[PDB]
Amino acid sequence: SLGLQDFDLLRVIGRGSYAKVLLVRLKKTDRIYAMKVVKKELVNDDEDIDWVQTEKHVFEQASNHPFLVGLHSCFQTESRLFFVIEYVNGGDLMFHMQRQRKLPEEHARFYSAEISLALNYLHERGIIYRDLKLDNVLLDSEGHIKLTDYGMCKEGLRPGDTTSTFCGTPNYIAPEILRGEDYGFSVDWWALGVLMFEMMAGRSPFDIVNTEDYLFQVILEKQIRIPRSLSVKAASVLKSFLNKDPKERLGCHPQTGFADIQGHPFFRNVDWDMMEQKQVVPPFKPNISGEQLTPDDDDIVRKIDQSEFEGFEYINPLLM
Ligand SMILES: N[C@H](CNc1nc(-c2ccncc2)nc2sc3c(c12)CCCC3)Cc1ccccc1
Ligand SMILES: [Cl-]
């Protein structure tokens, strides 16, 4: 099926330790896509045994939702896995906050709404995102958000289920994870609380003036206080999403969790349905505005365990 031959490696658009993301062009179609590349050796050594399976499953659910990147195709070389993904060209919230420094409540309200719809959808599908942060919140040309990089997702969580992996991006990691407690969807809502805080305050609730051990101490012990300039509505949601007790945290009620959010005074006057069909207009249009592969290690590749990657190839019959 697909392979590197069928593509033109245009540029690099993302680079972590585990994963690398390229901008690519499907030759025979002249369409542009984003490509996520990961060394299969690290997939075996660093990830849960069902990582490949969880990724494929998550992309499936994401193709049927407006605020989630969908999967075009994926293939494998001897040493790497390749995820060809719907391309988003509006940048991300981090880039936006970089120029904005601080967003009006209306803007944060909009974004946090769309983010909630994407999250609740994953939760409904028994999935925990587990890595919501500014730069994982992409923006399309129109100005709507899109969650990307599903590398941290947990799958198959039934009602009452609970997982126990310590993961995430330190600044956004929930207290219940820090305590080593079994957790569920609650971590995602805490993450949104932290993200909402950055949007409206212009800084993290845990900014300063063992560096990471100290950060974890701040999150667990230091009292979270909302700045005096924010409205009573805003102060509430922040404090509610940022409740260190998963049981008492906003959006975490097993039954009325997501209803409690939509009902929150902060989200008053929000048409969720129109929000979900993109019938609500974004407060910022990235358009009209603003401003190669590492060689394999033959001694490693030769001994790689290809088991988990058998039958990895795939193409989506419906263009995401
Ligand atoms: N944070 C953006 C660049 N990084 C990434 N962008 C996208 C992406 C997906 C779809 N359309 C666009 C981007 N997906 C991913 S998955 C991943 C990373 C990443 C980096 C860390 C490792 C895992 C910022 C950015 C936005 C737009 C263009 C270039 C960069
Ligand atoms: Cl507190």
Task: Report on this structure.
This protein has 320 residues and is α+β, with helices and mostly antiparallel strands. It folds into two domains: 1-87 and 287-320, Phosphorylase Kinase, domain 1 (2-Layer Sandwich); 88-286, Transferase(Phosphotransferase) domain 1 (Transferase(Phosphotransferase), domain 1), CATH 1.10.510.10. It has helices at residues 40-46, 51-63, 93-100, 105-124, 175-178, 186-201, 211-221, 232-241, 257-263, 272-276, 298-301, and strands at residues 7-15, 19-26, 31-39, 71-76, 80-86, 137-139, 145-147, 314-315. Strand 1 and strand 2 (19-26) form a beta hairpin. The radius of gyration is 20 Å and the shape is globular. Bound molecules: ligand C58 and chloride ion (CL). Residues 13-14, 16, 19, 21, 34, 36, 69, 85, 87-88, 91-92, 135, 138, 148-149 line the site of the ligand N[C@H](CNc1nc(-c2ccncc2)nc2sc3c(c12)CCCC3)Cc1ccccc1. Its main location: cytoplasm. It is found in: Cytoplasm; Membrane; Endosome; Nucleus. The modification Phosphothreonine is found at residues 165, 294. This is Protein kinase C iota type.
State Rg.
Answer: 20 Å
The set of bound ligands, ions and cofactors reads:
the ligand N[C@H](CNc1nc(-c2ccncc2)nc2sc3c(c12)CCCC3)Cc1ccccc1, chloride ion
Fraction of residues in H or I helices:
25-40%
**Number of helices, where a helix is a run of at least 4 consecutive DSSP H or I residues:** 11
Keywords: Acetylation, ATP-binding, Cytoplasm, Endosome, Kinase, Membrane, Metal-binding, Nucleotide-binding, Nucleus, Phosphoprotein, Proto-oncogene, Serine/threonine-protein kinase, Transferase, Tumor suppressor, Zinc, Zinc-finger
Enzyme class: transferase
Protein name: Protein kinase C iota type
GO molecular function, one term: phospholipid binding
